[PDB]
Amino acid sequence: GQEPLTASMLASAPPQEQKQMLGERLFPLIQAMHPTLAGKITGMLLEIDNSELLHMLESPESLRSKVDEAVAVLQAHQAKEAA
C-alpha cells in the first residue's frame, strides 16, 4: 500500500502535477463508491480547487456530499445503461 497525501507533499510537486496527485489518490478512494466513472468525477472534483480539496481530504462530511452531488448531476441531463 501507499501513504496518504498532505499539504507538505502537494507543495513539493509543481502545480501541474498536484492535480494528478490528488486525482490519483482519489481514484481508489471513490472507486469504492462509484468506480464506474471514478476518474471522470475525480477530474471535475479535483479540478474544483486544491485549496478546498486539501481540507476535503480530512472532511468525510463534505467529501461524500460533493461526490453525491456530481453523481446526481448526471441523471439530471441523461442516464445511460453502461456496465
Binding site: 482519489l26 476518474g39 472534483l45 479540478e47 452531488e69 448526471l74 441531463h77
Partner: peptide
Amino acid sequence: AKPFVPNVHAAEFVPSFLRGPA
C-alpha cells in the same frame, strides 16, 4: 438545489494515452 452544479460534460483527470479508437 445543487450549490455547486458540476459539469457532467467534464473530462477525466487521468492522462490521455493510447491513440485511435482502441
